[PDB]
Amino acid sequence: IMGSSVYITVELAIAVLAILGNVLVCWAVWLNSNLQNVTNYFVVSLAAADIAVGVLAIPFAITISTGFCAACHGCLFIACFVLVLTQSSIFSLLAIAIDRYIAIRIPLRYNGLVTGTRAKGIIAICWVLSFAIGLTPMLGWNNCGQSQGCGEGQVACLFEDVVPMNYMVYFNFFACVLVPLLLMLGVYLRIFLAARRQLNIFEMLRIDEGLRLKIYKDTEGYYTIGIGHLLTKSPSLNAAKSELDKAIGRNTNGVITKDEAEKLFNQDVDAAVRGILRNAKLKPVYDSLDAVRRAALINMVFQMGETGVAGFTNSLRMLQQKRWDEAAVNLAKSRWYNQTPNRAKRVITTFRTGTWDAYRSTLQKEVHAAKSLAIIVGLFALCWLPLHIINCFTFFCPDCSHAPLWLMYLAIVLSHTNSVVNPFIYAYRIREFRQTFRKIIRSHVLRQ
């Protein structure tokens, strides 16, 4: 058996798995409306690039491994096409990382800013940039515009013979790969730290009532800032800014920092606590509650007012009697629960447990998808970095012994393997994908 026959068989197997797996990804998104969100628009664009790796890039790699004689511009397309697909993968991975960041940082205003029309525009632009970046050697930055044994007008189609190494290192690796990879590392780190933020009264009502650092209108149309801090009933934003500047201590033009919103919210808590202590019905309960259960009581006061909370005579006395589970059942049978069940369920869970578990869980639900997508970037890095580092050695140590043939084969094949792994990750970590996969395979493929 020839070593070439092993290499070709391995490449063709990777090609088939790349096409089949990533066709299944696009097929699932097209079939399942629950997978038709903006995040999976970039998943499909990423899946399309990996299909093209199996149909074209891998066959292109097998042909240029022979170093055949070809015209320079035709040889450069065969060699540089995989650079287009790899660059498109980077832009899609970059878009997925950014999309998940604003999803957890502005969870309320995510849909208004992140839309399907904008995602489709970014995808079309990124595919154009990928061709411009990948096929840059075709536009003049190549080493065949100036191989003995090929005849003039042709060159031996060898990648390192035709693709300049300073392009591969400075422009492609450092600027077009390393920088987006490090930015993706910082974005996902920022996502993971936000999910691990310490919970307190400020973060509890940030989840329940939102945080806005810019002045906005509420459900009535009253100007508001921070965590539900009313500024004025006047129909003038300038009147609201005047109230904001007085409370903050500086000219704001309607924008504040997170610490300024937290300080403004700390004063609102002190006012609500002073009102609770003045109420003869609420003070004995508040005095008996622990710090976290007091935050749930302040939560209700911020939503319904001191008088509204005082109307929970039965639930309040069971809270003061430390009968947590009984108070939960009673509070769930109230109008406040029926009107806003999600916020009420989180507040009632706080009363039962005395922990922030209901608000931590809200944070983890927003980031579990991010951990699976972050694994894909790591596998992309692990699969492509060996080639980039080899290119850096050849570039910066010219008299160094070139990497042996077996490592070159392994690094090239490993890079192609990256076009197979993503559908396996979705299947193992994302249930909506795994379930759609099973339906497609059992129904459309296996017919039963």
Ligand X SMILES: CCCCCCCC/C=C/CCCCCCCC(=O)OC[C@H](O)CO
Ligand Y SMILES: Cc1c(C#N)cccc1-c1cc(-c2ccn(Cc3cccc(C(C)(C)O)n3)c(=O)c2)nc(N)n1
Ligand Z SMILES: CC(C)CCC[C@@H](C)[C@H]1CC[C@H]2[C@@H]3CC=C4C[C@@H](O)CC[C@]4(C)[C@H]3CC[C@]12C
Q: Which residues are catalytic?
A: 209, 218
Site for ligand Y, residues 411 to 430, rule: CB under 6 A: 412
- Are residues 180 and 90 in contact, defined by beta-carbon separation less than 8 angstroms? yes
How many CB atoms are closer than 10 A to CB 243? 17
In angstroms, what CA-CA distances link 99 with 166, 294, 371, 409? Answer: 32, 36, 13, 35
Q: Whats the size of the chain, residue-wise?
A: 448
Does position 424 interact with ligand Z (CB under 6 A)? The reply is no
Does position 22 interact with ligand Y (CB under 6 A)? The reply is no
- Quick one: how far is CA 30 from the chain centroid? 21
Question: Binds 410, which of ligand Y, ligand OLA, ligand X, none (CB < 5 to 8 A, cut-off by type)?
Answer: ligand X
Please list, residue by residue across 319-331, b when 16 or more beta carbons sit within 10 angstroms of its beta carbon and e when fewer do: beeeebebbbebb
Does position 58 interact with ligand X (CB under 6 A)? The reply is no
One of 393, 424, 431, 439 touching ligand Z (CB under 6 A): 393
CB of 374 to ligand Z, least distance (A): 17
Question: Binds 277, which of ligand OLA, ligand X, ligand Y, none (CB < 5 to 8 A, cut-off by type)?
Answer: none
One of 275, 386, 409, 435 touching ligand X (CB under 6 A): 409
Q: Give the residue with the Cβ less far from ligand X, 47 or 344.
A: 47
Does position 178 interact with ligand X (CB under 6 A)? The reply is no
Task: Report the amino acid identity of residue 307.
Answer: T
Task: Report the amino acid identity of residue 237.
Answer: L
How many CB atoms are closer than 10 A to CB 306? 15
Give the ranges where 196-290 is alpha helix by DSSP (H).
Answer: 201-209, 237-248, 258-278, 283-288
The size of the interface with ligand X (CB under 6 A), counted in residues, is 13
Dist CA 234 CA 240 (whole Å): 8
326 is in an annotated binding site: no
For strand 155-156 and strand 212-217, is the pairing parallel, antiparallel, or unpaired? Answer: unpaired
Q: What residue ranges bind Na ion (CB under 5 A)?
A: 49-50, 89
Q: Strands of 223-226's sheet, edge to edge?
A: 212-217, 223-226, 229-232
One of 65, 224, 299, 422 touching ligand Y (CB under 6 A): 65
One of 30, 396, 424, 428 touching ligand Z (CB under 6 A): 396
Residue 379: name the closest of 332, 428, 333, 345 by CA.
428
Q: Give the residue with the Cβ less far from ligand X, 47 or 381.
A: 381
Does position 369 interact with ligand Z (CB under 6 A)? The reply is no
Q: Give the residue with the Cβ less far from ligand OLA, 292 or 427.
A: 427
Binding site for ligand Z (CB under 6 A): 389, 392-393, 396-397, 400
> Which residues belong to the annotated binding site for adenosine?
160, 391, 415-416
> Which residues belong to the annotated binding site?
160, 391, 415-416
Binding site for ligand Y (CB under 6 A): 61, 64-65, 82-83, 86, 159-160, 168, 384, 387-388, 391, 405, 408-409, 412
